[PDB]
């Protein structure tokens, strides 16, 4: 029951990291993405991140190893502390609502080239109440519900 939709989504996420498109994610590529989000992982942390999933021992992450990384993380995310941390990454002005403009800004900072329509689509997918924004409860639902 893996869908074509889920695969395309994983593919988009992989390509966010794989900025040179060589089909592998290196420590440098992980470092660049986490730094674009205001984090500062050390070389050792980056190596440990790859090591957790590096099935062939080659020092980089390929597609199925990236899928493994994501699946582990989905399973590991129930804590309000982790989810609230992710929420604040997107709720730039801290007003408790992720707007289409805030999501556009974060996507741009990540290097993801998305149309205005694609960003509105993302807000619509997570918006439950229909106010046109994403509140914390809606963000939780998006993260824990699948």
């Amino acid at each position: 029951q893996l869908t074509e939709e889920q695969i395309a989504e994983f593919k988009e996420a992989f390509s966010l990291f794989d900025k040179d498109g060589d089909g592998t994610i290196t420590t440098k590529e992980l470092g660049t993405v986490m730094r674009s989000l205001g984090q500062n992982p050390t070389e050792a942390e980056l190596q440990d991140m790859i090591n957790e999933v590096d099935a062939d021992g080659n020092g980089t992450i390929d597609f199925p190893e990236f899928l493994t990384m994501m699946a582990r993380k989905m399973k590991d995310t129930d804590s309000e502390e982790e989810i609230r941390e992710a929420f604040r990454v997107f709720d730039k002005d801290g007003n408790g609502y992720i707007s289409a403009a805030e999501l556009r800004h974060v996507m741009t900072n990540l290097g993801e080239k998305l149309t205005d329509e694609e960003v509105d689509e993302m807000i619509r997918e997570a918006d439950i109440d229909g106010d046109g924004q994403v509140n914390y409860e809606e963000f939780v639902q998006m993260m824990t519900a699948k």
Partner: peptide
């Protein structure tokens, strides 16, 4: 209608 969950998880990868 476009699921964004994988992006929202990225800040949590560091765990």
């Amino acid at each position: 209608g476009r699921n964004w969950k994988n992006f929202a998880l990225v800040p949590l990868l560091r765990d």
